[PDB]
Amino acid sequence: PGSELISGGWFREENDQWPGQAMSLRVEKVLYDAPTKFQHLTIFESDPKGPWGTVMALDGCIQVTDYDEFVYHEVLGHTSLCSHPKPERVLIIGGGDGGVLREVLRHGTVEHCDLVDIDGEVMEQSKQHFPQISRSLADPRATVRVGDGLAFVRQTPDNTYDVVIIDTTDPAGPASKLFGEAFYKDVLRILKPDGICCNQGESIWLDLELIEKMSRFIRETGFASVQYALMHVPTYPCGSIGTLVCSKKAGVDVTKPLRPVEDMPFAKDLKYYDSEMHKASFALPRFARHINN
Amino acid sequence: MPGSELISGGWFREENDQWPGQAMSLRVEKVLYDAPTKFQHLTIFESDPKGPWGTVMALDGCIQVTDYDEFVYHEVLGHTSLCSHPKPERVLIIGGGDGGVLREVLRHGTVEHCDLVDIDGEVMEQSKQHFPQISRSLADPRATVRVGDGLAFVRQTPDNTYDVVIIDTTDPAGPASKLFGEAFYKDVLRILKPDGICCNQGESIWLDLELIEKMSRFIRETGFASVQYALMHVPTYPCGSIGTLVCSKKAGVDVTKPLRPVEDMPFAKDLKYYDSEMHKASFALPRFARHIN
Ligand SMILES: C[S@@H](CCCN)C[C@H]1O[C@@H](n2cnc3c(N)ncnc32)[C@H](O)[C@@H]1O
Ligand SMILES: C[S@@H](CCCN)C[C@H]1O[C@@H](n2cnc3c(N)ncnc32)[C@H](O)[C@@H]1O
Ligand SMILES: Nc1nccc2ccccc12
Ligand SMILES: Nc1nccc2ccccc12
């Protein structure tokens, strides 16, 4: 999908990844619509009568809106770092909008974070059109690279990172191999012994089979535990998205915060996450419970 | 007020000024019913067979039930309210013409009778024709189903009649308008026994937080000792979640922790969403919505 999804004054998120349905947002003004070296990227201002603000899509899939971006950025950044006893070195694969990095960089334990995203235009357009999301990209604790995540992890030493956050687009497109076992084996390797990873873990309404397959192979590759956390995101298909939160060490329970954010100075700045939302996120509907046991 | 025009060009588009600038849309395979009733515009369609949704019902343009995800809200409102009551014998459902909450209520062996009053007789008839797995309890001998305005019904009902009242309404635009108002809740307080519980269709935290907070305030001021909002995951409500205000008439009641766990009941394994972990988790709210309680 590309430009054709902006039609009759609406962006219509039709995709064969979710046949028969489409979330639609009304378009006030298209700001940017262009092929990049890897994806089709569309940025528009939504109807000022509604709350969504600026919207970004990649290959026809809504990625961020001003209104709800905080949810997924806070969940991935804090569920993973508050599960880690001292997260000092962090990798973000994908993430070129800067939102997960903004949250990671709230933590005073972080010494460095690498962020590697295949598509340098996402960083550029995020700087221009989403300054509250992309401010973080310039921080000297970060090294921001344009490149493929799979090649990057293949060149990375053993035991490099305390946390890896895999903040990718859906499987159709350049993120395809980042949902595969060979990538996860590398993520396990580049984590330190107390390492934690988490990802963009898709929808229990549309992708339950892929989430089953992934949780299985991630455990089989050698992660000691894998728990899926659900969160409320209106502008992801069916209104929620989840993250598989994976511990390299045994006997770790990522479902209860190890280092609670309320004991951190920035707790009251967050709009979604806290420790009760952390715990609640791992309670799954009975039809999906088997992901977590 | 929308009607027939929302289906055009092969799709149903849920455009509504209750959520400006957004619309969920579903492909239409076949229109089964599409007509004004005495009160509302009722539309029923078979969605795309390549999609998971099945049969869809809308009232005044607003999606009410799909085959795929109807279980969520019907289990959450029925079991979250009944499992918070020490012995729920007499139950009233206002609205609920599809039968889905009633189906769940009648799984409880404590229930002696459940009265259900929906203003629109055509919803019950079409639910019997098009949604048999949702409407399978409307003709149960433990239920009495009446066609009428619930505002009048609660006014006429005597004090101290019900253990639990469940207000399963359409959104405020239309014939449900006064069921989001203070006079109605004064009657629901009055018709509850001293240890009564109610809960409602509590809208979206993303779209309706002003109204939801207004209601929590006046329901407390009316005389309910505690009002706590429970959130749940419903793809086919605007923004993907719906909440319910769960309100205890008496003090000393913690509706957020099940008083009678479903796991001790013979039907817990038949449910597709609800269980005690999910009941505890549903009362965790995102920070921005925390002032509801
Ligand atoms: C936009 S971000 C998701 C929105 C919430 N932050 C997802 C990013 O994943 C990148 N992505 C996709 N495939 C890859 C690969 N192979 N490697 C690195 N980054 C990737 C893609 O360019 C998006 O910017
Ligand atoms: C369809 S049900 C909600 C879908 C999930 N069960 C909402 C019912 O509310 C009824 N409704 C709306 N207004 C009222 C009034 N005023 N009284 C009773 N029932 C009402 C409406 O006719 C629907 O069938
Ligand atoms: N839409 C949306 N919202 C939050 C996170 C996302 C990650 C990947 C694709 C879409 C996303
Ligand atoms: N769409 C939808 N799903 C579950 C419950 C509802 C209640 C009222 C309006 C819509 C609903």
Of A238, A271, A283, the CB nearest to B286: A271
Q: Rounded to an integer, what distance in angstroms lies between the CA atom of residue A2 and that of residue B262?
A: 48
* Proportion of chain B in helix, strand, coil states, percent, rounded to 5: 30, 30, 40
Q: A90 CA to middle of ligand 2, Å?
A: 51
Burial label for A19, CB within 10 Å (0-12, 13-18, 19+), is middle
Q: What 3-state class would DSSP assign to A94?
A: strand
Structure letter (DSSP) for residue A78:
I
* HSE (side-chain half, CA atoms, 13 Å) at A213: 8
Q: Are B120 and B155 in contact (CB under 8 A)?
A: no
**Structure tokens given for A249:** 């060490």
Q: Rounded to an integer, what distance in angstroms lies between the CA atom of residue A242 and that of residue A76?
A: 9
Fold of the B69-293 domain: Rossmann fold (3.40.50)
Q: Rounded to an integer, what distance in angstroms lies between the CA atom of residue B51 and that of residue B66?
A: 12
Ligand 3 mutation target, pool A25, A64, A93, A238, most atoms within 8 A of CB: A64
Atom of ligand 2 lying closest to residue B74 CA: 6
Which residue is closest to B281 within chain A, CA to CA?
A: A280
Annotated binding site of B: 40, 118, 149-150, 169, 201
Q: CA dist B138 to B80, B106, B123, B134, Å?
A: 21, 10, 12, 9
Q: What is the CA radius of gyration of chain B?
A: 18
Burial label for B160, CB within 10 Å (0-12, 13-18, 19+), is exposed
The sign of the torsion formed by the CA atoms of B148, B152, B153, B154 equals positive
- CB of A285 within 8 Å of any CB in chain B? yes
Which amino acid type is present at position A117?
Answer: D
- CB of A290 within 8 Å of any CB in chain B? no
Distance from CA of B77 to the nearest CA of A (A): 15
Question: Can you list the alpha helix ranges (DSSP code H) found in chain A?
Answer: 69-74, 80-81, 99-104, 120-129, 131-134, 149-154, 181-190, 208-221, 275-281
Q: Which CATH number fits domain A68-293: 3.90.1150.10, 3.40.190.10, 3.90.1170.30, 3.40.50.150?
A: 3.40.50.150
Is B127 close to ligand 4, i.e. is its CB under 6 Å away? no
**Dihedral in degrees, nearest 10, Cα atoms B126, B11, A20, B65:** -30
Of B51, B273, B286, the CB nearest to A272: B286
Q: Rounded to an integer, what distance in angstroms lies between the CA atom of residue A74 and that of residue A268?
A: 12
**Dihedral in degrees, nearest 10, Cα atoms A208, A212, A214, A218:** 150
**Structure tokens given for B285:** 């709210």
**Structure tokens given for A280:** 């609640």
Is A200 close to ligand 3, i.e. is its CB under 6 Å away? yes
State yes or no: A97 annotated in a binding site. no
Q: Could you count the other beta carbons within 10 Å of the beta carbon of residue B140?
A: 16
Which A-chain residues 191-250 have CB contacts (< 8 A) with chain B? 205-206, 230, 232-234, 238-240
B241 contacts A233? CB cut-off 8 A:
no
Vertex A164 angle, CA A158 and A167, to 5°: 140
Which amino acid type is present at position A197?
Answer: C
Which amino acid type is present at position B32?
Answer: L
* HSE (side-chain half, CA atoms, 13 Å) at A131: 1
Q: Supply the residues of B annotated as catalytic.
A: 168
Q: Are B37 and B120 in contact (CB under 8 A)?
A: yes
For B44-77, the DSSP string reads EEEE-TTSS--EEEEETTEEEEETTTHHHHHHHH
Structure letter (DSSP) for residue B266:
T
Q: What 3-state class would DSSP assign to A288?
A: helix
Residue with tokens 């203070």: B182
Domain boundaries, chain A: 1-67, 68-293
B206 contacts A68? CB cut-off 8 A:
yes
Q: Are A73 and A64 in contact (CB under 8 A)?
A: no
A37 bridge partner residues = none
Chain breaks in chain B (C to N over 2.5 A) after: none
Residue with tokens 């219509």: A12
A230 contacts B240? CB cut-off 8 A:
no
Ligand 2 pocket at CB < 6 A:
B 59, 64-65, 73, 94-98, 100, 117-120, 123, 149-151, 168-170, 175-176, 179
**Structure tokens given for A71:** 């949810």
A287 contacts B21? CB cut-off 8 A:
no
Of A19, A47, A274, the CB nearest to B51: A19
Q: Could you count the other beta carbons within 10 Å of the beta carbon of residue A275?
A: 18
For B67-109, the DSSP string reads TTTHHHHHHHHHHHHHTTSSS--EEEEEE-TTSHHHHHHTT-T
Q: Rounded to an integer, what distance in angstroms lies between the CA atom of residue A124 and that of residue B104?
A: 52
Q: CA dist B174 to A50, A55, B97, Å?
A: 21, 32, 15
Residue with tokens 């969160």: A231
Run of H or E including B196: strand B192-200
φ and ψ at residue A181, rounded to 5 degrees: -55, -40
- CB of B284 within 8 Å of any CB in chain A? yes
Q: What size, in residues, is chain A?
A: 293
Strands B192-200 and B241-248, bridge-based pairing: antiparallel
Residue with tokens 């007789």: B121
CATH code, residues B1-68: 2.30.140.10
User: For chain B, how many helices (H) and strands (E)?
Assistant: 8, 13
Q: Supply the residues of A annotated as catalytic.
A: 167
Q: Rounded to an integer, what distance in angstroms lies between the CA atom of residue A205 and that of residue B222?
A: 39
Sequence-ordered strand ranges (E) for chain A: 6-7, 10-12, 21-35, 40-46, 54-58, 61-65, 89-94, 112-117, 142-146, 161-167, 191-199, 225-232, 240-247
Q: Could you count the other beta carbons within 10 Å of the beta carbon of residue B264?
A: 10
Please determine, looking at this structure, whether the domain spanning A1-67 carries the CATH number 2.30.140.10: yes
